[PDB]
Scaffold this motif. Structure first.
Motif, short mmCIF file in Angstrom:
data_model
loop_
_atom_site.label_atom_id
_atom_site.label_comp_id
_atom_site.label_asym_id
_atom_site.label_seq_id
_atom_site.Cartn_x
_atom_site.Cartn_y
_atom_site.Cartn_z
N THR A 103 0.87 -1.17 0.00
CA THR A 103 0.00 0.00 0.00
C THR A 103 0.90 1.22 0.00
OG1 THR A 103 -1.65 -1.20 1.26
CG2 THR A 103 -1.84 1.18 1.16
N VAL A 104 0.78 2.06 -1.02
CA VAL A 104 1.65 3.22 -1.18
C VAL A 104 1.32 4.23 -0.09
CG1 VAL A 104 2.22 5.14 -2.64
CG2 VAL A 104 2.02 2.89 -3.61
N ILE A 105 2.25 4.44 0.84
CA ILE A 105 1.98 5.32 1.98
C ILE A 105 2.59 6.70 1.83
CG2 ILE A 105 1.70 3.45 3.60
CD1 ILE A 105 4.52 4.09 4.62
N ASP A 106 3.63 6.87 1.02
CA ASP A 106 4.33 8.15 0.99
C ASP A 106 5.06 8.30 -0.33
OD1 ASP A 106 5.14 10.55 2.78
OD2 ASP A 106 7.03 9.86 1.92
N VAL A 107 4.87 9.44 -0.98
CA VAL A 107 5.47 9.74 -2.26
C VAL A 107 6.26 11.03 -2.12
CG1 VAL A 107 5.02 10.42 -4.60
CG2 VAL A 107 3.84 8.51 -3.68
N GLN A 108 7.53 10.99 -2.47
CA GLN A 108 8.39 12.16 -2.52
C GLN A 108 8.72 12.48 -3.97
OE1 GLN A 108 9.17 14.06 0.10
NE2 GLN A 108 7.87 12.68 1.29
N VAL A 109 8.74 13.77 -4.30
CA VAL A 109 9.12 14.26 -5.62
C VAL A 109 10.14 15.36 -5.43
CG1 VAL A 109 8.38 15.46 -7.68
CG2 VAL A 109 6.99 13.65 -6.78
N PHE A 110 11.36 15.14 -5.92
CA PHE A 110 12.42 16.13 -5.87
C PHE A 110 12.69 16.63 -7.27
CE2 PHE A 110 13.30 13.16 -2.43
CZ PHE A 110 13.21 14.02 -1.36
N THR A 111 12.85 17.95 -7.41
CA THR A 111 12.97 18.59 -8.71
C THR A 111 14.26 19.39 -8.77
OG1 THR A 111 10.57 18.72 -8.96
CG2 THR A 111 11.91 20.13 -10.35
N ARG A 112 15.11 19.08 -9.75
CA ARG A 112 16.29 19.90 -10.01
C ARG A 112 15.84 21.26 -10.53
NH1 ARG A 112 19.63 21.03 -14.38
NH2 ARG A 112 18.35 19.70 -15.74
N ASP A 113 16.47 22.32 -10.02
CA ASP A 113 15.92 23.66 -10.17
C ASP A 113 16.08 24.14 -11.61
OD1 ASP A 113 14.74 26.09 -9.65
OD2 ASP A 113 16.30 26.79 -8.29
N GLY A 114 15.01 24.76 -12.12
CA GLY A 114 14.88 25.12 -13.52
C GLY A 114 13.83 24.31 -14.25
N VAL A 115 13.65 23.05 -13.86
CA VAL A 115 12.71 22.16 -14.53
C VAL A 115 11.30 22.55 -14.13
CG1 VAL A 115 12.13 19.71 -14.91
CG2 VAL A 115 14.48 20.40 -14.48
N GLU A 116 10.36 22.45 -15.08
CA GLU A 116 8.96 22.76 -14.83
C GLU A 116 8.37 21.77 -13.84
OE1 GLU A 116 7.18 22.70 -18.64
OE2 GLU A 116 7.90 24.70 -19.21
N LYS A 117 7.83 22.28 -12.74
CA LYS A 117 7.09 21.45 -11.81
C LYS A 117 5.75 21.08 -12.44
CE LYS A 117 9.10 23.77 -7.79
NZ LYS A 117 8.77 24.53 -6.55
N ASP A 118 5.41 19.80 -12.41
CA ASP A 118 4.10 19.40 -12.90
C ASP A 118 3.06 19.61 -11.80
OD1 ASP A 118 5.10 17.37 -11.33
OD2 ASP A 118 4.72 15.77 -12.78
N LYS A 119 1.83 19.17 -12.06
CA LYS A 119 0.72 19.52 -11.18
C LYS A 119 0.80 18.78 -9.85
CE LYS A 119 -4.33 20.03 -11.26
NZ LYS A 119 -4.35 21.48 -10.94
N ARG A 120 1.34 17.56 -9.84
CA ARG A 120 1.44 16.85 -8.57
C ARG A 120 2.61 17.34 -7.73
NH1 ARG A 120 -0.76 12.97 -5.59
NH2 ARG A 120 0.70 11.85 -4.23
N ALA A 121 3.70 17.79 -8.35
CA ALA A 121 4.77 18.40 -7.56
C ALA A 121 4.32 19.71 -6.93
CB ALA A 121 6.01 18.62 -8.42
#
Lengths: 41, 492, 50
Positions: C32-50
């Motif tokens: 059961t998926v309990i926790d999702v992390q999203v890390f973004t290198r700076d400059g890249v477009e954040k999508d809607k879930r980030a």
């Protein structure tokens, strides 16, 4: 191959078979009748 | 993107002789089907692609009909005209609908529809576009060699096939080899090979001569006939209307250079070139080359010719395995019997003696008078029975009464044979008895009667096993005749 | 089989002859998926879930 296959065939169908004369058809009827069976059941 | 859409459509048209309009109509149908698949409820969709921008609008189409059977895809003419008075039966009413995003799913649907006209149909289109090649000697690259056929690539997504029977017996092709052959048939196998190419048939020889001999391409020399034993030997018959041109010399060329070019393309096939003559006997003499013919006797009734040759030339006239006589017979259309001068004389003496014996036996004439009839050219009882009275009256010693008596005797001799055919066999009397069984001629009726089956009742009483030994009667044909006989005797 | 050279008329992009396939994951474990992390290198477009 079986008596159950023979009993389903009609007299008119058996007369179309190769090497099947009127005499052999009468023999088949007399033998089936001796066992209480008839052609076309 | 905008111009790229139009350029792509034009490239499809160029790929396999298609049309920009036909490609767009098909893309519209493809996109309509893709949108209808996405739509859970099955509803008619109508897609329209703008021909300048490549932009496309998608509708909920409503087939204007008189009686609505499918309310999800059909609208009455009265209801359609409430929205637009210009609509007729068979038009579409639209509804502002979100056009399907062109994902790789729609891309796969539309590009396959375009490939159905620019890959599979490109094969057929290229074959048709090359109207000359379709019929003449097309050139292909060997793509694949199988046991039973060779697949050729003609370019433009056109694939051709050479069947095993369509190859020369000693040819060995490898993938990447260039091969020439005549396109002799175009079928409808767009997916795969619709084109059939031959190297073995006579058309390959004719078209090689058309290319190598300018005088044939200019219609100055005509090829009248071609007979061929593929990869071994051929004969061609040539005619010209120009008395200044030697047609044989033109086809041979300077020191045989032209005929050797054709022979080399055919794997070293020997080609004889003969002059066409309008006289059949002179044409057969020419066809028999290189053998010298001493005499020809023509039998027009049997469509046969007896060819006498010197005993030294007999082996050359027949050729290796009868190849020379067979090619001459195929080239002339006549059946050709090659014999020595001595054998021809012995054959004619035996035929004359058999005719004399026949006339003496059936016409009740002396051997001297029968010999005169054979010397005047009469060989059969039919000729004597049916020939014009004037030809029989030209014979020295025949008067009108004797000719009438001879004809009556000849007709009566044939009527005696017809009496046997009627009763003994089965042409009239036993035709309604031993031959009554459907599928029995006079010969079969006499074969049946030789087994004691004389009547239609006797045949109705037989088994297939009782008739199985009769030459020309298959078990199926025996069964059909016995059943026909039973139907008449027992059920008539 | 579907010539992806006519892609410019329909899809767009250029040529989708490249094998289309979505990175799908293997088996052996439930959960059961309990926790999702999203890390973004700076400059890249954040999508809607980030």
């Amino acid at each position: 191959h079986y008596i159950g296959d023979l009993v389903q065939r009609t007299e008119v169908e058996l007369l179309k078979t190769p090497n099947l004369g009127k005499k052999s058809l009468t023999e088949i009827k007399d033998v089936l009748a001796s066992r209480g069976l008839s052609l076309g059941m | 993107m905008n111009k790229e859409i139009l350029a792509v459509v034009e490239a499809v048209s160029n790929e396999k002789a298609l049309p920009r309009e036909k490609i767009f109509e098909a893309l519209e149908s493809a996109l309509a089907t893709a949108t209808k698949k996405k739509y859970e409820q099955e509803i008619d969709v109508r897609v329209q692609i703008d021909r300048k921008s490549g932009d496309f609008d998608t509708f909920r189409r409503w087939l204007v009909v008189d009686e609505v059977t499918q309310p999800t895809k059909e609208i009455t003419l009265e209801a359609a005209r409430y929205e637009d008075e210009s609509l007729n039966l068979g038009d579409y009413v639209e509804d502002q609908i979100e056009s399907v995003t062109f994902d790789r799913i729609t891309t796969q649907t539309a590009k396959q529809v375009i490939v159905q006209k620019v890959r599979e149909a490109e094969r057929a289109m290229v074959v048709d576009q090359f109207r000359e090649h379709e019929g003449e000697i097309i050139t292909g690259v060997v793509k694949k060699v199988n046991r039973d056929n060779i697949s050729l690539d003609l370019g433009n997504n056109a694939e051709a096939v050479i069947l095993r029977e369509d190859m020369l017996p000693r040819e060995n092709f490898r993938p990447g080899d260039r091969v020439r052959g005549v396109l002799y048939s175009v079928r409808p196998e767009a997916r795969g090979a619709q084109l059939f190419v031959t190297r073995s048939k006579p058309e390959m020889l004719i078209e090689l001569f058309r290319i190598e001999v300018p005088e044939i391409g200019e219609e100055v020399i005509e090829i009248k006939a071609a007979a061929r034993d593929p990869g071994s030997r051929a004969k061609i018959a040539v005619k010209t209307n120009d008395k200044r041109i030697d047609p044989v010399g033109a086809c041979v060329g300077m020191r045989g250079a032209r005929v050797q070019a054709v022979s080399t393309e055919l794997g070293g096939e020997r080609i004889d070139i003969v002059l066409w003559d309008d006289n059949p006997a002179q044409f057969v003499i020419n066809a028999m080359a290189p053998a010298d013919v001493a005499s020809i006797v023509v039998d027009e009734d049997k469509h046969t010719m007896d060819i006498a040759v010197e005993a030294g030339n007999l082996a050359q006239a027949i050729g290796r395995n009868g190849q020379n006589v067979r090619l001459a017979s195929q080239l002339s259309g006549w059946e050709l019997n090659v014999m020595t001068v001595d054998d021809l004389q012995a054959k004619h003496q035996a035929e004359a003696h058999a005719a004399i014996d026949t006339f003496t036996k059936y016409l009740d004439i002396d051997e001297d008078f029968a010999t005169v009839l054979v010397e005047e050219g009469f060989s059969t009882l039919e000729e004597l029975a049916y020939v014009p009275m004037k030809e029989l009256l030209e014979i020295e010693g025949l008067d009108e009464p004797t000719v009438e008596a001879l004809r009556e005797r000849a007709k009566n001799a044939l009527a005696t044979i017809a009496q046997a055919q009627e009763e003994s066999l089965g042409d009239n009397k036993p035709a309604d008895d031993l031959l009554n069984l459907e599928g029995v001629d006079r010969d079969l009726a006499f074969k049946l009667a030789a087994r004691g089956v004389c009547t239609l009742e006797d045949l109705a009483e037989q088994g297939i096993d009782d008739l199985a030994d009769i030459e020309g009667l298959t078990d199926e044909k025996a069964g059909a005749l016995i059943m026909a006989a039973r139907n008449i005797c027992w059920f008539g | 089989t579907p010539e992806e050279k006519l892609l410019r008329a329909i899809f767009g992009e250029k040529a989708s002859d490249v094998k289309d396939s979505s990175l799908r994951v293997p088996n052996g474990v439930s959960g059961t998926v309990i926790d999702v992390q999203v890390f973004t290198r700076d400059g890249v477009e954040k999508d809607k879930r980030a």
